[PDB]
Design a protein around this ligand. Sequence first.
Ligand code: MG
Ligand code: MG
Ligand code: MG
Lengths: 106, 117, 65, 99, 88
Amino acid sequence: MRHYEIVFMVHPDQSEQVPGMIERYTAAITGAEGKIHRLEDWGRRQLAYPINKLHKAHYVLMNVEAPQEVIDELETTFRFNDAVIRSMVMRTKHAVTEASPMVKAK
Amino acid sequence: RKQVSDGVAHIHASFNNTIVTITDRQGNALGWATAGGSGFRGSRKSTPFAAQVAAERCADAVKEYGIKNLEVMVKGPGPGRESTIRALNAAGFRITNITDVTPIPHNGCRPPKKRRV
Amino acid sequence: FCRFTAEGVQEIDYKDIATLKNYITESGKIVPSRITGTRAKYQRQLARAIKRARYLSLLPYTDRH
Amino acid sequence: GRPQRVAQEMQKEIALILQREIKDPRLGMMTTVSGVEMSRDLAYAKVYVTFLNDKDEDAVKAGIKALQEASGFIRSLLGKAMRLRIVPELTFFYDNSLV
Amino acid sequence: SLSTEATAKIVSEFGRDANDTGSTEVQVALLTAQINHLQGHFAEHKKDHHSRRGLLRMVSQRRKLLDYLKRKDVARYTQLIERLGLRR
RNA sequence: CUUGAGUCUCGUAGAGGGGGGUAGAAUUCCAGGUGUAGCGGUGAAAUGCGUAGAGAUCUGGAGGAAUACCGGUGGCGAAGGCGGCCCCCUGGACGAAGACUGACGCUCAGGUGCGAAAGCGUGGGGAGCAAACAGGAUUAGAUACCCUGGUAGUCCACGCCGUAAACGAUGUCGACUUGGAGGUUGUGCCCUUGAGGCGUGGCUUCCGGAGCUAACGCGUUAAGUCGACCGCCUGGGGAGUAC
Ligand SMILES: [Mg+2]
Ligand SMILES: [Mg+2]
Ligand SMILES: [Mg+2]
């Protein structure tokens, strides 16, 4: 497993599964040695530039030391699934568990 | 027929050609002014003076719907474009803003070769 | 003129929208360190950081969008 | 070469460098060039540029010198933009476009 | 390229002790492992000539060591060449 | 023997490479909407093209192509070179610190590769661009340049091809010798400490001493001093040609 910081958004309207899918996603984390070092959700936030004619996307973040494979199916999932509206996955030198500029406002 | 009262026009401040259009507040452009269409041709169509005079053609369509405000766009850096803006201020129609919106790409389109002497 | 060093961040978290907005014009073009006097690596870090935030929709490509 | 003919092509090139490539703009405006007056052999170019700066020599003067101060640098720009062996001497003139 | 852990495993057996890190043996063994990792990359990436350039920089390296070793004690060489299963 | 050489551990920057993704403009097309009399072209027209409603505007889609700002002496590289974001793979550089190996070296004919663009091959793909060719604008050589088009080509994949003013028009390595100003990137110390003060590495730049050079200049990133190996030339034309 290796470090990552991950953020994506689901369509604001599909927020019914948004609380569960996270851990339902961490099913991979929780079930494949995923050491989630941090996780953040920010909720609907107005998009600076509209994506796919959508606004106020449901912002969410993750911080994990994860193995090479898990992330893959994890993002292909996103690539597969459609409730999510945009995705992102970046490696991190080390684990980040400090208030993030989004949450640090709170 | 229907009043709009919030003027929004589109101009095409090209070098060799000078053309303004009248637009409805929600897109739907309605009516236009072509300085080339006035019969001005070649250098005469491109003259800044032709662009300044083309105000009357834009104004008559604006008068028909009786629109007042001014939210117009400029695309292209035409010669003496500021003088055309001065002519719109000389007209005395209430001005809210002008937008310098010459479109800039990321170099994605392949440019054509420049002409030579 | 060593202002990022005064902040003390050798690595600049990209999620810092408030710093990014100062380094972003109304159009959204990145101001150079010619006038901001920032050191290159941070300049380097900021340019890559702005694009990724822009992809995430944190930063606008241009208001006209 | 034929000056009255090359003038049209040069004016387009002068406008492109003037609008997107500026970091000392005392004008700080979309200044538009009414006309150019290249000499035979294009040795000297007279650039008559109107100023969106309220058409007052006070604001206009700020830019015309700014137009003249950065000339060698901008020379390079237009000088490497039309494959010209003649890099035109640069001169700047507020035009009384409005009378 | 490698994992420090794999390098440590090679150093423990090929080297006399963990500190013994220059011994020609402990050198050629690491180079051979590095070539194997690069060969897996080249199997799908033949285009990546740039990485092949280094590939050369080492196959020749041990090649020099081999000789340097071979001209030093074939004894170790002889076992080394078969210890590393090379030049069979 | 250990300083040459090289390994280990600690980092560290980097448009290095290969792959796979993905974004946003732009352009074209297409969709609509509203909305027209033109449009674009020239020095002027022609040429183009419009009531099928074009031209313009929004809204949408499709496609292909390339990645603005940042961004520059700024890096990365043997060089050709490398410029959107992500992930996978992978080369090298460098610092620090200590250990390990112990001359394990340099150069290289022959050698094997590497390789700008166009070009050849197959099959791809097709925005935009543009040789060829095409319509209008001509005679000092108009054979035109200009505008209007436009296939190949331009992209991919795999192939060939192996040359470019592939240029620092400066072979490789090592050593030695005045300066100053930069940049860059390391890192030590000492100040709380940014800044600051001492450093000390790497790489890069501009002057510039001596020295050298026909001169031009070069100038510790020498064309100064030296060393080692390689490569090459011997008036010019014929001629990098006949064969
Ligand atoms: Mg090509
Ligand atoms: Mg050659
Ligand atoms: Mg070259």
